[PDB]
Design a protein around this nucleic acid. Sequence first.
DNA 1: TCGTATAAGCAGTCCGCG
DNA 2: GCGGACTGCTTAT
Length: 901
Amino acid sequence: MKEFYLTVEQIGDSIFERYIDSNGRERTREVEYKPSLFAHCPESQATKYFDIYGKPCTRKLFANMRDASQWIKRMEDIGLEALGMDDFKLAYLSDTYNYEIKYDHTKIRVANFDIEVTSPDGFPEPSQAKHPIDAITHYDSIDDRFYVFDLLNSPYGNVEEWSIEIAAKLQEQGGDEVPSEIIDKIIYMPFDNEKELLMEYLNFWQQKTPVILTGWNVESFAIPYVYNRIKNIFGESTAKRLSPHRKTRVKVIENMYGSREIITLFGISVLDYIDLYKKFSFTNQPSYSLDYISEFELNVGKLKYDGPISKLRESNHQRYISYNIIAVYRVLQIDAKRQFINLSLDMGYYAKIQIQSVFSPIKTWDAIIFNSLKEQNKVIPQGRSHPVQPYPGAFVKEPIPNRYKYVMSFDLTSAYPSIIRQVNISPETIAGTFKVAPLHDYINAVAERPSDVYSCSPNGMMYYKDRDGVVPTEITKVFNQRKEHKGYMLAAQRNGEIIKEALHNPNLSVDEPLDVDYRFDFSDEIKEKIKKLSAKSLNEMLFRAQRTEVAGMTAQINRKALINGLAGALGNVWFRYYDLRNATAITTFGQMALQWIERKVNEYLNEVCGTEGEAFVLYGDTDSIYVSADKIIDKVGESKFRDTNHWVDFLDKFARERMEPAIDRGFREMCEYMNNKQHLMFMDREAIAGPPLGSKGIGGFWTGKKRYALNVWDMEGTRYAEPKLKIMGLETQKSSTPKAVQKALKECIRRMLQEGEESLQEYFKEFEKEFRQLNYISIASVSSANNIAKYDVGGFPGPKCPFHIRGILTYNRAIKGNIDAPQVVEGEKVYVLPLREGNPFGDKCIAWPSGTEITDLIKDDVLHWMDYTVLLEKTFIKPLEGFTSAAKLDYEKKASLFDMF
DNA sequence: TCGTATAAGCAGTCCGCG
DNA sequence: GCGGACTGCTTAT
Ligand SMILES: Nc1ncnc2c1ncn2[C@H]1C[C@H](O)[C@@H](COP(=O)(O)OP(=O)(O)OP(=O)(O)O)O1
Ligand SMILES: [Ca+2]
Ligand SMILES: [Ca+2]
Ligand SMILES: [Ca+2]
Ligand SMILES: [Ca+2]
Ligand SMILES: [Ca+2]
């Protein structure tokens, strides 16, 4: 096999590299790598190295890496550009793996671990590590085993061995219900004392050294705790054995308000799963506890125990150890579904970076562009300092708040990357500028043609047409990857809808799910067999289809995120290719493209409707248009349609055969107007929306910019078995809205769009009547809590104190003195409830850590004093009033003359 | 919340508004 | 009461 790196580090003048050799074995080596950097040289000096602008460069080979670094410093002192890749390990990788990397994940040791630490005095601080580590479960991907290190004797209690038999048993048998599929994979090791546990762990670690290290909060908790605990007991040298090169750094992570410390382990790639999830999941969650995320992702129940976690080991060590094991398994189960590790390896090897750098699109793109340019003997520019400057972004149309019955939406495929490719926007493709007219002059095609030579953006920039820039070239490669995976995702989704339809008529037989590839549209033969399957087989097939779709989504959406991140990076001062001329060239072209096509679509439809000056485009945001289709439906007449699916087909056909060709012609004209390199504005139909045929449903509504709801029948070619709501911006979509309130608001919207005013009125009346019975957590608001200390004046709210922060201070007074009560962590999320007048807490609200039950000594009081009236008005009634007034209907039945009877 | 971008919504505090 | 200035938070793209 072809070799591939596992990890790479610079330590002084040495590169330390772990890698897989040509025989598939893991090796480590130290290489005294001699980097090269570049300086501009005279024309007369014959060379093969040129900067991105075509100026000649001489290569400077250094005796070692420190010499290269010192040289850069001296070039700054002289005031001359020092060109080349200044991150020497990236240059090393580029030299050592000069080809597209093929990797074999089965040879990469992925370690998933979790530790337990009993603490009788609050949260066990990793930087102090003053409490014994009493459990470690460490899953190894190569062995496919869970290694369990269990402390039987502690100053906090001596316990019996954990029992695998009891662990396997049902909760109803008094067991822990450790999944049977992992029971045979557990290797249990009990220890008489902590010193031996930790020494054995380190010896084990040496034998099975993680390449990728992950788990839940491992970077912020498990790793620093293990490091500092070993350090305290044995000393520094022993703790450094967690690094295969025996090198570690305390690394300070700074944000806006305060900073935290982590331990960098040289030669390990730490991908904390909480961070993987936050970057790649595209969720915003009320809580990020593993229990909360596992429930969300996997639909598994809460890991239940009685009493505090600080007493769980002594009261029920059996359960304590089982839950540690299950906690490790939960992360593996999340990864089996979401496939974020697979994603990270894919992108990391593609860019030729340390795998952990996938968290940084700037580093990712710096490496991609460097490797690309190097292939042509081109030399990258030096990074420069820039002040942070604001710059303009997208255009958003102000909608008229209203109901909108029939709607067709269109938007650009990969808008910003497509603009980059069309205009040829790149550091080295800048050809000059032209004299800019007001944007509206280009939108209405009255401005002078910008250039007859170069490709233009309406911000004034001109670009070469003779060759693609490196940014267009490299963005296209990742875009094509994105396109392939989205194809699989959409196929799996359409396949899912086939199975849902068949589930209306399941067969009465015992059979098996079909062995199929869900990434491809089911053949007629598969469809026929599906129609003869049992519900059990169909449901299992549905689950598999949905898992395929999830895998597709992960692969496609994060590749989309990467390419959109390159457009974004052009406007970040730390990017090597930061340039507000290019950043604004993209965003300004985008504004033009939207409003240009708005005009063209309005013109086209007014033509087929024989009208003048009527606005068919009701809304647009960045790269999208929403077209009122009422007149299209009304030209055929609702009575001519057999059912809902019939008019959906008709609008589908109209969008595809009439609108899209008109859109394409309009953009082709715009391309010529701007003299662009290549027409790549592809605005395909997204949604076909409307009420069910013959219902009183309103179809859709807008309340304002970025706030709307649509009843969708077909989304990007997926024809649903059941209509699906597309809701954007409204409170149903906000993590801050109470869970039960999101649910009720969604049902109000569903009723509005599908059934109409009366149905909405019936539901509202019932919700108002019953809601006080809802669990307090389900009706708590959620907020991130920043700057708790800033607004804390003697335990009371300072001036301008935010409502949620007030809630926290209330909580802090009510739990004061308790070392055992959960503390609210700065920067994390809290549940927030309002409090009735004259409550014992002495303020109008209370907040506590999100994803948790509020501590028992104030729970009963919080429940007694909960202000349901304020809660209902603020979270439910206010938003609903917004929805209904926009839609021009009433959530409460108005009096009429009929009441006289 | 270490980690690409801008536009823009709503909640809440403070305080004016005769 | 509402709205503007402002802070805080959270979305859509
Ligand atoms: N997270 C982001 N960071 C930077 N720019 C973004 C982000 N999200 C959206 N944009 C910008 C770039 C996008 O091309 C443009 C339109 O967004 P959107 O329609 O969601 O995706 P897209 O047009 O890139 O892909 P798709 O093909 O899925 O529509 O808005
Ligand atoms: Ca735990
Ligand atoms: Ca788009
Ligand atoms: Ca599309
Ligand atoms: Ca059937
Ligand atoms: Ca869009």
